[PDB]
Ligand binder design. Structure first.
Ligand SMILES: O=C(O)c1ccc2cc[nH]c2c1
Ligand SMILES: [Ca+2]
Ligand code: NA
Ligand code: NA
Length: 225
């Protein structure tokens, strides 16, 4: 099935990504607080709702929040400044707070129910966000021998997410805080602050995509060049 692409709002970042964030894939962005990872998540939650000639998939979004990073008024602002109705856009983002890593897993199962429900409607789910995906796992699995268990649990969680992406043709977008641990996202993107208030993006361990870095801004429209 054809891979769909969601624009990030930034022409530069979209180019680095080969056109945007892909369905049937997990894209992981990681970086320090304020690197743009959460701003990008919010922007994508709006962009996915647009028609394809505007960089979206005529879809809705789901947002799993682990560290209280979700800001409804930020979504409304991004929407308003892109010519969209802020309340309608907010209503197309299904929010859930994950209380711990086990609840986080249950939420992914519940997400499947909604995805199935909307799959053949005029606005299917096309984006599932997990912000700070590892935070609960790092808090809960800690100490001697915790590495193996934590990595196994994360691998299973990521396998569940890969299944949703592939089975239902959705983009999964996950964020993490910032070197020898394994990772199983399809594509990993490192974000960092640059000069002039810009953020800089670099693909990590992606020999299949061309060499370069993207530059973008955080504005009233979310993310743009
Ligand atoms: O409202 C819901 O049914 C629901 C279930 C799971 C998730 C995961 C992110 N948002 C959700 C909403
Ligand atoms: Ca951010
Ligand atoms: Na895939
Ligand atoms: Na709606």
């Amino acid at each position: 099935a054809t891979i769909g692409r969601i624009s990030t709002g930034s022409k530069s970042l979209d180019k680095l990504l080969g056109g945007g964030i892909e369905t049937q894939a997990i894209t992981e962005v990681f970086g320090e607080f304020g690197s743009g990872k959460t701003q990008l998540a919010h922007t994508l939650a709006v962009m996915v709702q647009l028609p394809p000639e505007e960089g979206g998939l005529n879809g809705s979004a789901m947002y799993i929040d682990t560290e209280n990073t979700f800001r409804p008024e930020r979504l409304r602002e991004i929407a308003q400044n892109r010519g969209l109705d802020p309340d309608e856009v907010l209503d197309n983002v299904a929010y859930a707070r994950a209380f711990n890593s086990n609840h986080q897993m249950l939420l992914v199962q519940q997400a499947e129910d909604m995805i199935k429900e909307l799959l053949n409607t005029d606005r299917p789910v096309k984006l599932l966000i997990v912000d700070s995906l590892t935070s609960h796992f790092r808090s809960e699995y800690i100490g001697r021998g915790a590495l193996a268990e934590r990595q196994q649990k994360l691998a299973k969680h990521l396998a569940d997410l890969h299944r949703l992406a592939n089975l239902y043709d959705i983009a999964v977008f996950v964020t993490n805080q910032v070197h020898i641990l394994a990772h199983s996202a399809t594509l990993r993107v490192y974000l960092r602050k640059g000069k002039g208030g810009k953020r800089i993006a670099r693909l990590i361990d992606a020999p299949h995509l061309p060499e370069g870095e993207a530059v973008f801004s955080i504005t009233e429209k979310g993310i743009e060049d």
